[PDB]
Amino acid sequence: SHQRAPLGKSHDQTPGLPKGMDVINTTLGTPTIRELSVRDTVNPSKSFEDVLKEGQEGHDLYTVSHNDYFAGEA
Amino acid sequence: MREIVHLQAGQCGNQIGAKFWEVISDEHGIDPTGTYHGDSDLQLERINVYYNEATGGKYVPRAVLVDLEPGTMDSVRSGPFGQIFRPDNFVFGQSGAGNNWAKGHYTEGAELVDSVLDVVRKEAESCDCLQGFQLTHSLGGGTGSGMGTLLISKIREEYPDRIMNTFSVVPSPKVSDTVVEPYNATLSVHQLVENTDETYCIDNEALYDICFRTLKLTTPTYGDLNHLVSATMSGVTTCLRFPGQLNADLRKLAVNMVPFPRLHFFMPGFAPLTSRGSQQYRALTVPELTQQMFDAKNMMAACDPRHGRYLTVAAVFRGRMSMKEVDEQMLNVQNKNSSYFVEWIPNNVKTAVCDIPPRGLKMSATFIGNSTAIQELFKRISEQFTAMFRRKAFLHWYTGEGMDEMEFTEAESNMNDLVSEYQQYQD
Amino acid sequence: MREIVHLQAGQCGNQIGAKFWEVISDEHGIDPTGTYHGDSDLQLERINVYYNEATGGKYVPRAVLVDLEPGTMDSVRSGPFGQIFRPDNFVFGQSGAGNNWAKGHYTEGAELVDSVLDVVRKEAESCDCLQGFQLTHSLGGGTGSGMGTLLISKIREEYPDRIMNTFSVVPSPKVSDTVVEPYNATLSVHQLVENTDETYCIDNEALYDICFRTLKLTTPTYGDLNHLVSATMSGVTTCLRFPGQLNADLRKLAVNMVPFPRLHFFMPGFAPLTSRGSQQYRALTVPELTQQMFDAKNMMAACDPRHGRYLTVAAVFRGRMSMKEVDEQMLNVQNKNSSYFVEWIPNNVKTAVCDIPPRGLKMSATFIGNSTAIQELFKRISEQFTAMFRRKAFLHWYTGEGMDEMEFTEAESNMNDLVSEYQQYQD
Amino acid sequence: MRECISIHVGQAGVQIGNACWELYCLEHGIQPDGQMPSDKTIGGGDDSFNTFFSETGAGKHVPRAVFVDLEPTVVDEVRTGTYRQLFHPEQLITGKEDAANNYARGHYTIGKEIVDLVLDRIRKLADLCTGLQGFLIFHSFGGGTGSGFASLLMERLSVDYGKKSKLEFAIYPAPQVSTAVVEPYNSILTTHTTLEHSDCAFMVDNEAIYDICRRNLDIERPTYTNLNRLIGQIVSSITASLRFDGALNVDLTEFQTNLVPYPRIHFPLATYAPVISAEKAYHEQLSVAEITNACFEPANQMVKCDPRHGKYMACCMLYRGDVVPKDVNAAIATIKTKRTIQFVDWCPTGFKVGINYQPPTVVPGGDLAKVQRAVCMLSNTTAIAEAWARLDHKFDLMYAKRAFVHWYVGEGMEEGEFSEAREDLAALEKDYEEVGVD
């Protein structure tokens, strides 16, 4: 019957609460940006391998395009 | 053999150095434990320019860590590379900063300068012959400016024959957080001008804009800023450590870089920046690098030199390039804006080509600039200084410490002399 | 070599450009992912006329996309070839146009012209030697008219040595939907005639009629209309990219096509339009196609030049062709209607023969028209403008924007000059 | 190292004081016994408690504070409470008489024979500690026992220890609610004796704290338990820098050096933005931008200061939780561009920021929200002089007709000291206006 002034210890909102209380609620995950992000993008860990991958990427296509040049290539 | 010993100063330089050294180790491929894994001959031979030998193939960094607050030093000690740093190099004090320039410069410095001088000279005697030194700190830093001004003054007379490289970040123009910072800055720069020979200028706002522009990543960390500047710091230091038809000595560079003694303030410039899809949308060609390294948005130091002109320009190119393209880009940019340089000097460009690329990026470069783009920086602080000195705000501490208004009078006057000197050289 | 930078503007050109570009990619055989599959050497040789090269063998389009409403970009980006276009290339605004010319010509363009200028000059530097540029937009479009009139005015001074190709659609003469459209049209065309050298005129009503005539498919999509106009635009561009003794340069063409400077408005024409059974009921031969080429029904641009006479005509034939059948069919048409030509110029026909058939059919051609059929077009727009300015309807907005009735006074005087000009030369 | 000593004079200052260590124990999880579970944190006393508690080899975390008051009634009750085993028995300094709301009685009559005892307490804490940055003084202006007794002790700690900081935290007198007409006697008496020694005085008013409770926390009849927890949350937030770290760590020394403009005036005001009910944050979202609007929203401050009637000098914000510099610096940039916020032209920069990654936690059996991003907003403005302006016109009448003077002069004081504080107060008000005038 105390619903008129339901303050006796504290106010009640339980019927409007369909979930729990145990922990705090973060709006979103700024980590999601962090896993999406790689800090070391200026220096990827791809040493000599990607040199060959770009080396075999069709110099002839690029030569037909704009007269490509790698290492003295005529 | 000519080597370098590093100093990490201020609490910012503490984060900066922690980032800076691990970049060096990962570049050279030493594990966090410190046991180098032999993979590259060239980095094996030329690691001694910075590191010394410890037992068991351990390359001890030659850096001395100085601060006042333990927690910052404990944090960097607890880092993934805190082990590779030395407790011998961890010198500090039992006092809190207060972010006061004078306490560190006169009160807290007095009992610490004795110890740090011993450590560096022991480090100086440990090695044979330096090129010079480099310093990581901030000009507006509470403690770093205090000791930074002290140390540079002391280390001038013992060895006045070496390189006084400095790396200081300029605070944010919109807000300085610290409110007595312009006092600290004006104090620091007064001693900086006569005691330095080279200065690096860095601003976080531009770094914040870089994240919005090319990184496009919304929320970075402060450490997400640190590897950015260290990569530029590493890049300028790659030239010494690596072979290639390019002259490495800073004295090669500085004499080509400094026409007049008062020109110490120099600005960084860095090469390809890439976004989410443009890793696979970029044709890595020397023109578009030269285009991008010479972008108005690509300057990160203070602001756009568009208001002014270019005094001296020097860029180091890292990767597999050739002598001719650097020339014809140099011709292209020379023709692109012939009038925007100063008539005072033609051919104001100094180019270096490091044949050894980064360990995962091939076409790369680093740029160091001297334009007429510093005037607004110290004009900005000029109204800051005059207005607060107009009614001597926050003055009771420094008088309580023992500082007086006269010190400020010549400090601004020297800055005023610098104002015209930059103006009268260009305008 | 001579290359071209494309300009896309207006929310119409948003749909034309996407359709225009996907035709070219499918014409040259590049997959939607972008990895070109080598099938034709000639298209492999001459893709650099429009496309630059990136890594992975992908041909980056050298077009510029500009608008205001983000949703339009999301749609085209989610389109079949949005991945082929660059987020670098996507410039837009934080605002909506309101379908307002004055806002897009003075207010919103002010903070956006700088970026697009910085954009377009970047690719202008990325390319070596341009013949010029082409723009997709509309004369009756809100953003397209506001943006374009500013950019075309600016693009003249930096590069007054290239081609100002403008591709604009005429809104329906009977209906304009937007009630301020004649105001938008009158304002833009004042600068357009001042700034451009070439202009294509296209109208939707004829496209609807042509669907009734030859498509015969009741309910089309606007993209199919884009498929039509893009094919017409593609055909005139096949000349440059493809071999065969036909003379391709628009300057090889335009000087042959325009007698006097203020003549910029031209009418397209295209080759066999085919219905359900007539694909297998047509003997594709020169006489029938040239007959269909010169059909008053087959035209699609504005309206019938039967009301007037023909000033200049240029024809490009694409496919396995020969000089003799065309020579006689020019003789056929010349003797067919000699009086319907103007005695001002005899032999006003311009012929080009592309030996490379299109992807889709063997025998094809494109026509561009300069006849005396534009009078009623701007004569039409004259009456509404006079009627609307008679009691200045819908005027309080532009005054708040900062526009005055004076701008309209000379503008209509400018078109009325053309009305007399077009009338005087023929009649 | 990094530690401080807290003090609590006045039974007003005790139950607010009791709450904080009731709060302070939870975040480190101190059980009511005085020891951790089988997990290892005991030793030479070097862990998160070393800045706050003294957990020696015995394993009992000894709080580094003394509860001092002149009557046992409250303190012996908490000596029978739940945490009395933690508290050192004679760190609960009790008296045997009453100061009768008298500044002088507490300052003169009983103080002489008691301060020597607490002087013994403070030095024995001084010898054991190492860093001793400063002190935490919880008190009240109209202290029945807080007002008078604090004045002598703060003088004694000032004269012997003038090289370390002192931090004052007192409930400001309720402006329109008067629980004591002797409060205007003692409060101005306290201020004039403290203006020349106090380093940083921080105030608060209960009415708005109550007004906070029913505006957004939705409590029309709260208690001290709520009120003490609110201010306990406040002192917790500022002390998180000592406990944990963040993007940057800032110390009270920076607070002192960067907040107080000039001598005399050292009276900024605190404010905490995410003061919201649990269900409200449950179905809404929190970020820096909106709480920045709320923290500078004039009704979110607990003193009857209307900021547009004054002008801003210093403003300190302390972001505790998950934040990034980007949206923080962008949002504060908008604040500088704001026209309603009228800072003084003397300070182009006036913002002292503190970032702490650790999110503030809830308290068991509590009424607070579930906060990630939080900020304690310390600021100083010229809109505060009206408070002493309220006091002096209150004061000038009640000195014009010599009310209750026979009580004070009957125990050994005279009128000159009462006179002195008035022009001393008059000195401050003209100081307040001249700094207000640019």
Ligand SMILES: Nc1nc2c(ncn2[C@@H]2O[C@H](COP(=O)(O)OP(=O)(O)OP(=O)(O)O)[C@@H](O)[C@H]2O)c(=O)[nH]1
């Ligand atoms: N390490 C670090 N420094 C920062 C950061 N953001 C700003 N800074 C500034 O870098 C400056 C230089 O640090 P220090 O010279 O070590 O400062 P201090 O002398 O210890 O005293 P303070 O300036 O108050 O920090 C500081 O003044 C800070 O204002 C950050 O995210 N990390």
Ligand SMILES: Nc1nc2c(ncn2[C@@H]2O[C@H](COP(=O)(O)OP(=O)(O)OP(=O)(O)O)[C@@H](O)[C@H]2O)c(=O)[nH]1
């Ligand atoms: N994309 C598109 N445009 C159409 C279509 N039908 C007519 N149009 C017209 O093409 C014109 C040119 O588009 P924009 O210049 O981009 O228009 P805007 O500047 O964004 O402003 P609005 O004309 O109000 O849309 C529009 O004004 C339309 O009236 C259609 O089906 N698709």
Ligand SMILES: Nc1nc2c(ncn2[C@@H]2O[C@H](COP(=O)(O)OP(=O)(O)OP(=O)(O)O)[C@@H](O)[C@H]2O)c(=O)[nH]1
């Ligand atoms: N800080 C605080 N103040 C309270 C509390 N409850 C009531 N008050 C108010 O704070 C004032 C306390 O001042 P005093 O009454 O002089 O306290 P005291 O000097 O310790 O001695 P007492 O009169 O016995 O309480 C009272 O006037 C109350 O209006 C509380 O829980 N905490």
